[PDB]
Amino acid sequence: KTVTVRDLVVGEGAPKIIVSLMGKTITDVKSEALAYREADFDILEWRVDHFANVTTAESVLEAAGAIREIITDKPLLFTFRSAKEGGEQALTTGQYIDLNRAAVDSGLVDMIDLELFTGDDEVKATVGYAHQHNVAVIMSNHDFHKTPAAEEIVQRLRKMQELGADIPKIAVMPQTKADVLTLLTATVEMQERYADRPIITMSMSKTGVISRLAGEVFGSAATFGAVKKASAPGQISVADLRTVLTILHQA
Amino acid sequence: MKTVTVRDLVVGEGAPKIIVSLMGKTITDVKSEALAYREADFDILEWRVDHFANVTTAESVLEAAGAIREIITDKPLLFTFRSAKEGGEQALTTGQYIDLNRAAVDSGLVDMIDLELFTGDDEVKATVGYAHQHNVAVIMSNHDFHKTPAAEEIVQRLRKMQELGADIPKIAVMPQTKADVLTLLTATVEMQERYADRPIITMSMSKTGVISRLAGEVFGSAATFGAVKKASAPGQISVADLRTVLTILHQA
Question: What does the entry report regarding how activity is regulated (chain B)?
Fold first, then answer.
């Protein structure tokens, strides 16, 4: 099964390119958005944790509106990555939920990222809320230190499906070359045996970069590239990412 | 591991080296292909001798080898007779295959020969020693066009190759499933990290296994085959595109 967001069909054809916008202020958000129009991406992720005024609703809303006005074609993914999973700042569970609910209610965003480890009650409720306002949910988990066993990676991914995620997502850090392969094996087992929707997976750092390139074969429906700045280790430039995906899609 | 130097090319260091296969039936085909390949961006030229129509006529093989060496002067030359039993273009008895390879060594025109792991241990050891005595490196190989053996069998084959004197163990396998591609890569990592004391070449064939032809720098395959115009195996991509991907991965 696939997920359609603003006419982009995720889980079909070549993996979709996502780029993260990281602006600290409304001014930086506007200039970054304008500059990003030159890049060949499919989905724009707004990394809200990089934004300085995250607790001022009116400010968050104004920035989302600015992005939506500059980037009118592409799906917009609203992602507050918590400090706990590699993000720039922390919020209370309540703050995090209200933030995402406000994004959903604004009509400015097509998708939201919800971290699996937020709490089942909270995730369930917010997934329900998102779906009531036609907003898709990428449910995510990140491990910046290590790569868990394939079985544990699959366990997380299925729990994400179980909680109603439109797109389960997991990012792990390899400590060895074999760790890259463990992430790929979990991806294939999930996609072939248990998934009834698209999944996004990556092995981070330069070492796992191959996981960001071969999703068309192995099962990851989307991959992140960098415009000028990486939002995670291992991301290569969007132009290079497009070149490689294109070669693999036509090879 | 110890690197392997063929002419001025150091295999096993930096980004994987690109090898391309020259396939011609007659001497006219060989000359025409060698001329067309002069423009191509590759590091090692493999002559797929099994494609050549008159491999049992020493003078014809020698002239063809000379023709290639006169046209392509600055790239190492790998002489490869891929046997029918290993998915090649013609069958030879063990004796004809060994005599052919020895003729290649004796010509002084080739820098490397490809010897198939399962030819027979006695024959392989004697031939490896002979190549070495004459300053010819040996890529030892094994191919399976239908399936991917267990990772542990793949590693055992690469290790047996080392045991038999191979300068560069090489194995090409075919994935039935996506997971099979990962099995080939697992075997590559295990071999390179725990057992290899020299460079190795590995690939999962077909489009499905193409990542194995691109990710050698991270996973441990020292060389990779691309196609100029016609592929010498399933899943090879054009040399231009192969170079582009390798450079991108090198600078990631």
Answer: Inhibited by (2R)-2-methyl-3-dehydroquinic acid.
Which resolution, in Å, applies to this structure?
2.0
Question: Comparing C-alpha atoms, which of A74, A85, A84 is closest to residue A41?
Answer: A74
Q: Which residues of A are the active-site residues?
A: 142, 169
Report the gap between the CA of B200 and the closest CA in chain A (Å). 16
What's the count of helices (H) and strands (E) in chain B, helices before strands? Answer: 9, 10
Exposed/middle/buried for A69, CB within 10 Å: 0-12, 13-18, 19+? exposed
Report CB contact under 8 Å: A185, B182.
Answer: yes
Experimental method: X-ray
The residue to which tokens 């725990």 are assigned? B194
One-letter identity of residue B25: K
CATH 3.40.50.720 fits B1-252, yes or no: no
**From the CA of A206, how many Å to the nearest CA of chain B?**
6
Tokens 């057992």 identify what position?
B195
Nearest to B248 among A184, A217, A240 (CB): A240
> Identity (one letter) of the amino acid at B64?
A
Q: What are the boundaries of each domain within chain A?
A: 1-251
Residues in chain A within 8 Å Cβ distance of B244: 243, 247
